[PDB]
């Protein structure tokens, strides 16, 4: 049967600066009697990017790489350190041994980073008068730059909390501040949204002393 | 020389259709490495699918891809072919070419859907003393009702980076995506500055530029 690779943790946190160690069991040894060789390489893969060497035949870094990056290992044993975790390093990695067919990849871990309370700034917008020329209106709020991910952000529309009609996204943690940003928009049809005038969103985070309201009039 | 493995575009294709995605390989002699082909599920696992010999033109293909799969190459073009037919709701996903385990390319991305292709309606989101916090002001555009994923955004032609956010499409219950792209600047230079999204659904050939100002 095929090799299976199995990497551990599948998801680790870490502040700056911390050691990171991450792990890939092979079910088989991929050490070639023949070449002495491990036939493991490591990949990073960058939010929205496609996979990049780290590490090849276990333990040679890629030129270009960062000396941080550490691999070691033999047999059915492989580690990937990161001596000090920066900032960047923000990714999922994973293993892949080439030592039979077929190829055969470990699940990932992605690597998060920890850092310290930011607060989020907190922006609304109006639907666009396009927009509702077209018979509806989108009311945008936006938390930028905040961490951690945990925020509460509350609809009120002429002081009526709203349930049901809003949808939240977040990004991809920064490549350089660590922080999330995140936008919740509230949906509703024309006339809907021409019935009521004043339109809020209310945001709680622990990086808030108390919650924050941001409104316009219609 | 830098190796580069330019792939073909994102592609929308029905159940049953049939798709040929290209990897053009430069910057280095294409007979002198394999070209392997890989499978990115939408949920990150990988999947290995086999390999073509750039000198023969043989491929080999890993038990699962045995069927319905082709490799193939152009070779006065430098060029490796991955034809599927017979699509099924499974084949979406990104498939990757790669020189083995020392390159890969940037991936095609293909979603296979009964539904239509629709390309997005862009609205600004205009800043205001309610978009204001501190001396900074944030602006951005709607980007919304389209299918499939993905849309590429872009500020100023590329120019505006630095505090640009273009957030994780959500779906709506119509089965449509719709995202936003955010910025933030000084409020005190919104009348100076000005401020383009660049808007590029591929699948549907929809390009729009739209300025965004103080309302």
């Known amino acids: 049967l095929d090799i299976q690779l199995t990497q551990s943790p599948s998801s680790l946190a870490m502040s700056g600066g911390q050691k990171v160690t991450m792990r890939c069991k092979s079910s088989?040894?991929?050490?070639?009697?023949?070449?002495?060789?491990?036939?493991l390489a490591w990949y990073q893969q960058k939010p929205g990017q496609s996979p990049k060497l780290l590490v090849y035949?276990?333990?040679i870094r890629e030129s270009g790489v960062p000396d941080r990056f550490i691999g070691s290992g033999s047999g059915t044993d492989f580690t990937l350190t990161i001596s000090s975790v920066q900032a960047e390093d923000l990714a999922d990695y994973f293993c892949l041994q080439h030592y039979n067919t077929p190829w055969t990849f470990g699940g990932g871990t992605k690597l998060e980073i920890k850092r310290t309370v930011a607060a989020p700034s907190v922006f609304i917008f109006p639907p666009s008068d396009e927009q509702l020329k077209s018979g509806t209106a989108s009311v945008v709020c936006l938390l930028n730059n905040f961490y951690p991910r945990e925020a509460k952000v509350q609809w009120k529309v002429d002081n009526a909390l709203q349930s049901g009609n809003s949808q939240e996204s977040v990004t991809e943690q920064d490549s350089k501040d660590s922080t999330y940003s995140l936008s919740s928009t509230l949906t509703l049809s024309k006339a809907d949204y021409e019935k009521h005038k004043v339109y809020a969103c209310e945001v709680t985070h622990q990086g808030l002393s108390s919650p924050v309201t941001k409104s316009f009039n219609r | 020389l830098q190796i580069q493995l330019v792939q073909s575009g994102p592609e929308l294709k029905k159940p049953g259709e049939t798709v040929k995605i290209s990897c053009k390989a430069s910057g280095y002699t294409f007979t002198d490495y394999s070209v392997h082909w890989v499978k990115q599920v939408p949920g990150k696992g990988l999947k290995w699918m086999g390999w073509i010999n750039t000198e023969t033109g043989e491929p080999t293909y890993a038990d699962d891809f045995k069927g319905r799969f082709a490799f193939s190459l152009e070779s006065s073009a430098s060029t490796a072919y991955l034809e599927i037919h017979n699509l099924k709701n499974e084949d979406t996903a990104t498939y990757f070419c790669?020189?083995?385990?020392?390159?890969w390319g940037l991936g095609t991305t293909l979603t296979v859907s009964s539904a239509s292709t629709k390309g997005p309606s862009v609205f600004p989101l205009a800043p205001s003393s309610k978009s204001t916090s501190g001396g900074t002001a944030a602006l951005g555009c709607l980007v919304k009702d389209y299918f499939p994923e993905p849309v590429t955004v872009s500020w100023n032609s590329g120019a505006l980076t630095s505090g640009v956010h273009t957030f994780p499409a959500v779906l709506q219950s119509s089965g449509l995506y719709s995202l936003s792209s955010v910025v933030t600047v000084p409020s005190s230079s919104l009348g100076t500055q000005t401020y383009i999204c660049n808007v590029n659904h591929k699948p549907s050939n929809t390009k729009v530029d739209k300025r965004v100002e103080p309302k």
């Open positions: 088989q040894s991929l050490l070639n009697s023949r070449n002495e060789r491990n036939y």
């Open positions: 790669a020189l083995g385990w020392l390159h």
């Open positions: 035949f276990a333990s």
